[PDB]
Amino acid sequence: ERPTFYRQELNKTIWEVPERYQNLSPVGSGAYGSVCAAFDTKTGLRVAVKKLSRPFQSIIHAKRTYRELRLLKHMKHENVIGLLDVFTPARSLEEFNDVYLVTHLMGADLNNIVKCQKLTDDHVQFLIYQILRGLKYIHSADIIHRDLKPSNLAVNEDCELKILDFGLAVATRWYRAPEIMLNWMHYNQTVDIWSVGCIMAELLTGRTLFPGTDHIDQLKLILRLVGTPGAELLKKISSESARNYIQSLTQMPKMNFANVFIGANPLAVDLLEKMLVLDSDKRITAAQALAHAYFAQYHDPDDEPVADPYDQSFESRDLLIDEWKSLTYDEVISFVPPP
Ligand SMILES: Cc1ccc(-n2nc(C(C)(C)C)cc2NC(=O)Nc2cccc(Nc3ccnc4ccc([N+](=O)[O-])cc34)c2)cc1
Ligand SMILES: CCCCCCCCO[C@@H]1O[C@H](CO)[C@@H](O)[C@H](O)[C@H]1O
Numbered sequence: 001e002r003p004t005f006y007r008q009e010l011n012k013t014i015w016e017v018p019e020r021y022q023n024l025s026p027v028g029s030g031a032y033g034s035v036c037a038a039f040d041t042k043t044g045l046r047v048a049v050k051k052l053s054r055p056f057q058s059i060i061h062a063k064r065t066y067r068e069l070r071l072l073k074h075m076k077h078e079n080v081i082g083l084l085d086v087f088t089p090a091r092s093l094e095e096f097n098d099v100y101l102v103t104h105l106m107g108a109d110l111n112n113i114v115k116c117q118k119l120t121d122d123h124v125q126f127l128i129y130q131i132l133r134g135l136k137y138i139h140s141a142d143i144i145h146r147d148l149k150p151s152n153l154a155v156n157e158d159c160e161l162k163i164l165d166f167g168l169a170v171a172t173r174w175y176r177a178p179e180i181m182l183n184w185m186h187y188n189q190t191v192d193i194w195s196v197g198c199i200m201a202e203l204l205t206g207r208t209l210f211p212g213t214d215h216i217d218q219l220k221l222i223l224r225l226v227g228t229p230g231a232e233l234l235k236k237i238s239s240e241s242a243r244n245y246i247q248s249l250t251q252m253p254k255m256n257f258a259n260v261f262i263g264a265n266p267l268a269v270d271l272l273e274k275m276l277v278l279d280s281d282k283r284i285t286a287a288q289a290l291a292h293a294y295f296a297q298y299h300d301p302d303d304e305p306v307a308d309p310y311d312q313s314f315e316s317r318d319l320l321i322d323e324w325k326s327l328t329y330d331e332v333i334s335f336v337p338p339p
Contacts, residue, residue: 030169062324079134081164106154140306148195197275227254
């Protein structure tokens with residue numbers, strides 16, 4: 001039946017969780033939610049418990065809540081966050097006002113690793129391999145992460161990496177594809193490969209590749225490496241004023257990456273070239289990057305799985321808060337823990 005719950009206040013926040021979850025201490029807080037570390041007595045594992053903030057107080061919050069539960073319930077991959085539990089104190093839908101999501105506790109992110117050691121090439125290989133493996137899986141479900149950066153990549157003592165979203169309220173713009181910042185209205189998956197490129201570069205050199213101070217600086221820093229748009233790419237911009245603006249800048253040539261990333265594995269350099277192309281249609285995909293000779297030690301085409309079909313049709317619906325709430329509630333109730 002239903003577990004026995006208990007109540008406590010942590011930081012002017014009520015946490016009402018099943019008894020199984022003990023030793024709650026706050027680790028993160030913000031507009032989106034708050035998180036406590038906890039011990040799961042049933043399994044012996046340390047867990048993160050995320051309580052959504054105001055999950056049904058607005059239409060946008062209500063859809064986000066549903067969006068996040070659905071996505072997390074779907075992700076079943078070693079290199080992506082998985083859901084251990086989801087629960088509510090509510091005994092009925094008419095009572096339903098709070099949602100808590102439980103996953104493995106992940107205390108260290110890739111950002112921590114990159115500050116605190118200079119990585120071997122085998123170390124870069126393993127980490128980048130695992131990011132592309134999770135992304136291949138995420139991209140197969142027609143999900144775009146949009147915010148890949150070191151602080152959204154958990155890494156454990158054993159160097160095993162999981163993609164998630166740690167955010168609850170390392171500038172995002174440093175890792176962002178040039179078209180996101182251009183407000184290109186219809187961008188795609190390949191934006192995530194730009195980010196992987198930036199993270200891989202930083203793993204090789206130990207420093208941010210493009211530490212822009214704003215969006216304009218960001219773009220300048222990008223063009224110094226990859227060059228001003230060519231003829232073919234200028235064609236894919238139908239705006240004349242954009243083209244004339246770009247043509248009126250000091251033209252930057254493309255740098256040879258092998259000349260920039262000095263002393264990196266030539267294979268890593270070649271892979272980087274394929275990731276950090278301005279024209280997103282030319283970027284290497286996650287599935288393709290996995291088969292690149294840089295990962296010969298890791299690649300197994302038979303252990304790089306794709307997602308089950310993911311029904312995302314809700315994204316295009318405009319619904320009432322209590323419709324989003326009832327749907328979220330169906331998802332809480334139907335949840336089956338992993339073994
Ligand atoms: C509205 C929305 C929709 C989806 C997501 N989302 N998306 C994804 C992808 C599948 C694409 C990677 C993942 C997420 N959400 C997500 O990761 N949520 C999510 C769910 C439970 C716990 C957490 N945080 C944490 C997990 C594990 N150790 C942690 C340790 C510390 C902290 N800390 O100090 O703040 C947070 C932790 C994140 C996030 C927000
Ligand atoms: C100021 C420097 C110019 C940067 C140009 C970025 C080119 C982005 O690449 C573009 O992304 C679009 C969005 O998916 C695609 O539809 C286009 O096919 C692709 O060329």
